[PDB]
Structure formats: structure tokens, C-alpha cells
Write a protein that binds this DNA or RNA. Structure first.
Ligand code: CA
Ligand code: MG
Length: 430
DNA sequence: ATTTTGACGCT
DNA sequence: AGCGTCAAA
């Protein structure tokens, strides 16, 4: 009752760019705008592998991981943009730089946590409080929320999408308690006003559209963000959680999309997130561990406490290349040449990072996959990263992995290498 | 023969 | 330190 917490203390948003790499290429090449389009890496094998897909192309069934030749089978007029290749490998610089454009705009509004190349969490709690004081008890107009969905509404006693959106928004605003600056629902609504402004700024200043979720924590904000895509935002209130979760597959919640989620389904014999409420905290801890158990117990009730970390920059800078099937690296010369290519791209990115961000990486992590392993990485070794020098970095990576060569022969490498990975880590201020 | 990334937990 | 899990384009 009165001491039972409800996880309504914060306002958190998750902003996610729509079909991000596609939008970067469409900004650059107007011929691709408003077209079924995809971004591919490496044309030679089956037309290249698709990594991003415009919504027009998704309507034909084109997806990520599809080979372009197969996507062309689904969408004969599919347009393609290729990832740049440098030093023999795909180079993602253009997308990292576009990401920086968007992150810097978001940072003007509030503290952000960079969650991936195209998404960031936003802690809006303080901005909401300040805006509520500026408003001076003044009601919130639907005009301030032109692209917002209220999850769960309309409800109770129009057949077009925008009509439904406006009906739900009207019901929500009609109900709000604006005279109470401490109402969680009002705080979320002001949060949504701010996110509308943030999203307008992103589009004005970059050309890129995005979707967003607004709720009381990161998991619900991420879930909300995905409910109305593209170019829309969704408010998930605490009160919307019981109905939302009653038919929500467990795997849709962040961190439960893999083995743990599968084990929750199998061990408990349930399918939907809401069904978790019927277990005690200790029961969940017994099956899934203390940390996971407590997390599940609170999360199925819509409560999560993970903070929006103040971190706009990535914590690691990495480069990797797969060598699939018959192209696996089988000679010492091959392994060293590709370590050099990787180290050169890495030196370039590290030098840029040092100039822009006043920091230096101090550890180099080397990872390889050997032919036969189902595991993504077969081996990981580290060494000191003392100079941004590609020849030195490539020499050190070879030195720390050379003893993996089973081969009795001088020049040959066995078992062949199907992956090389260099990652600069452990940044210190400079 | 999705590939190329990034963060974080366990022991 | 090294391995495993989960997730983004
Ligand atoms: Ca996205
Ligand atoms: Mg994303």
C-alpha cells in the first residue's frame, strides 16, 4: 500500500533512428529517398549482405541478414547503397559520424546514454520538473504532441490510424491532473512534449527521422519506442503496464530475447511477461539467480532501476573481419597482412578519437575465431597499447596470437583463421 | 557465407 | 584476465 513503490520516480526516453544507415545514404543521394532501398556490405557474394532496409522495402518482405540477390527476388526494383570499403574491409565511418551529429543534438536537451550507433536513452526528470514550473499550471494542448501515441488508448464506449492516435491522445489529455506537479502521468506527458521538441530538432538539423519511447525506466522506454514506428513516439504509462504485459511475449523485453528468456518460458511454463507476477521474488531468484530474479520480479510489474548512464561516447573502438568458408587465413603472410589492415583502420580511428575527445586507449584486445568453432570468438588475448602505431599494434597482436598456430610448418597457419578482431579499450584522459 | 560492431556479467 | 550473453546497423 503506502510503502509499496511503483517505479514512477523518473522520466526516461529512448530515441531510435528509423532505418538509420538507409537514411544516411538517402540524405546523401536524393535518388534513394522515398524508395524501396537497402544498405549492403560486399557485392561479390550473392549481391552483398543487407544490413539496413527502408520501410518501403520492408513492405515487400526485405529484411536484415538477407542476401541482396534474394531481396531482389522479393523486390525487383530494390535500390541498393554499398558500405564503403577501405583497406579490403567494410568501413562504417560515415554512419559513426552521422551518429555523432544526432548524439550532439540530443545532448543539448539532457544527459544521454549512447546505447548503440543509432539509439540513446535520455533522463528527462529534471528537464520535466523545470518545464512544469515554466508552464505555471497551464494545461497541455494536443498541438504539443502531434506524433505521440498513448499506449492502451483509445478505450471504452474512426477507422484510420491518425484518427485512433488523436482519440487516444484526447482521452489521455482530458483525464490529466495538471494541478498536481507530482503526478507521474503529468510528468510523462511533459516528457513527451520535450521529446517531440528533441525529435523536431534532430530532423531539422540533420534530415533524419526517428521514433521514441517515453516511460519511467529504460526497459519500458525501449519497448514503447518500438510500438509505433517509424517517425512516431509512444508514451507507456505505469497504468498501461498490466494490459500491455498481458499478451507481451517475454522475448520482447530487453535482455530476455536470448537464452535467459527461453529458460524463463521453459522453466515456468509461461509465455507472456504479465504471467511473471504470479511468482514470488524468492521463486524467481531460485530459478534465475538473485540478480535476475529480483530484476524479473520488479520488471513484470513495470519497475526497473537501471540508471541512464552519463556516457555519450563509446567505451571501446574496434575493427574486425570474417574470413568465411574457403577464404579462411592459412598462411603467416595472410594473417599478418590482415592484422596490418585492421591496425591501420584502428590507428586512424584512434588518432581521430584522441583529437576529438581528449583520451587515449591503453589496452589492445586481440580476438580470433578458429575454423570449426561454433563460438563467435575462439581466443582473446590482451597487450599494452602504448603508441598509436599500426605497424606496432599489428606486430603486438601477432606476437600475442602466434602461439596459437598448431602447424608444424614454417609459413602455414593451422587451423585456418576465420575471424580477426582488434579492439582498443581502457581509455584514460589525455 | 550475415558482417561489423558495442556493453556488460561471470568466475 | 578470459569467456559468454545480448543487442545494434
Ligand atoms: Ca533504429
Ligand atoms: Mg536502434
Amino acid at each position: 500500500g503506502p510503502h509499496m513503490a511503483t517505479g514512477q520516480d523518473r522520466v526516461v526516453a529512448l530515441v531510435d533512428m528509423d532505418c538509420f544507415f538507409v537514411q544516411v545514404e538517402q540524405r546523401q543521394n536524393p535518388h534513394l529517398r522515398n524508395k524501396p532501398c537497402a544498405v549492403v556490405q560486399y557485392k561479390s557474394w550473392k549481391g552483398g549482405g543487407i544490413i539496413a532496409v527502408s520501410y518501403e522495402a520492408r513492405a515487400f518482405g526485405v529484411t536484415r541478414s538477407m542476401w541482396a540477390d534474394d531481396a531482389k527476388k522479393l523486390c525487383p526494383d530494390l535500390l541498393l547503397a554499398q558500405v564503403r570499403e577501405s583497406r579490403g574491409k567494410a568501413n562504417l565511418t560515415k554512419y559513426r559520424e552521422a551518429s555523432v551529429e544526432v548524439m550532439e543534438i540530443m545532448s543539448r536537451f539532457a544527459v544521454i546514454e549512447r546505447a548503440s550507433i543509432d539509439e540513446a536513452y535520455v533522463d528527462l526528470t529534471s528537464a520535466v520538473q523545470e518545464r512544469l514550473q515554466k508552464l505555471q499550471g497551464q494545461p497541455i494542448s494536443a498541438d504539443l504532441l502531434p506524433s505521440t501515441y498513448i499506449e492502451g488508448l483509445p478505450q471504452g464506449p474512426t477507422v484510420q490510424k491518425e484518427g485512433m492516435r488523436k482519440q487516444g491522445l484526447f482521452q489521455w489529455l482530458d483525464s490529466l491532473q495538471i494541478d498536481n506537479l507530482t503526478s507521474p502521468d503529468l510528468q510523462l506527458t511533459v516528457g513527451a512534449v520535450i521529446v517531440e521538441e528533441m525529435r523536431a530538432a534532430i530532423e531539422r538539423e540533420t534530415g533524419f527521422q526517428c521514433s521514441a519511447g517515453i516511460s519511467h525506466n529504460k526497459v519500458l522506454a525501449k519497448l514503447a519506442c518500438g510500438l509505433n514506428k517509424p517517425n512516431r513516439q509512444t508514451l507507456v504509462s505505469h497504468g498501461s503496464v498490466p494490459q500491455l504485459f498481458s499478451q507481451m511475449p517475454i522475448r520482447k523485453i530487453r535482455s530476455l530475447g536470448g537464452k535467459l528468456g527461453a529458460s524463463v518460458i521453459e522453466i515456468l511454463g509461461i509465455e507472456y511477461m504479465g504471467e511473471l507476477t504470479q511468482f514470488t521474488e524468492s521463486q524467481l531468484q531460485s530459478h534465475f539467480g538473485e540478480k535476475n530474479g529480483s530484476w524479473l520480479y520488479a520488471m513484470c510489474r513495470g519497475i526497473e532501476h537501471d540508471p541512464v548512464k552519463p556516457r555519450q561516447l563509446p567505451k571501446t573502438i574496434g575493427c574486425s573481419k570474417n574470413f568465411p568458408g574457403k577464404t579462411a587465413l592459412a598462411t603467416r603472410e595472410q594473417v599478418q597482412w590482415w592484422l596490418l589492415q585492421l591496425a591501420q583502420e584502428l590507428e586512424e580511428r584512434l588518432t581521430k578519437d584522441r583529437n576529438d575527445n581528449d583520451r587515449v586507449a591503453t589496452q589492445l584486445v586481440v580476438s580470433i575465431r578458429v575454423q570449426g568453432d561454433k563460438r563467435l570468438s575462439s581466443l582473446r588475448r590482451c597487450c599494452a597499447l602504448t603508441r598509436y602505431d599500426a605497424h606496432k599494434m599489428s606486430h603486438d597482436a601477432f606476437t600475442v596470437i602466434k602461439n596459437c598456430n598448431t602447424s608444424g610448418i614454417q609459413t602455414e597457419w593451422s587451423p585456418p583463421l576465420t575471424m580477426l578482431f582488434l579492439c582498443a579499450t581502457k581509455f584514460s584522459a589525455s
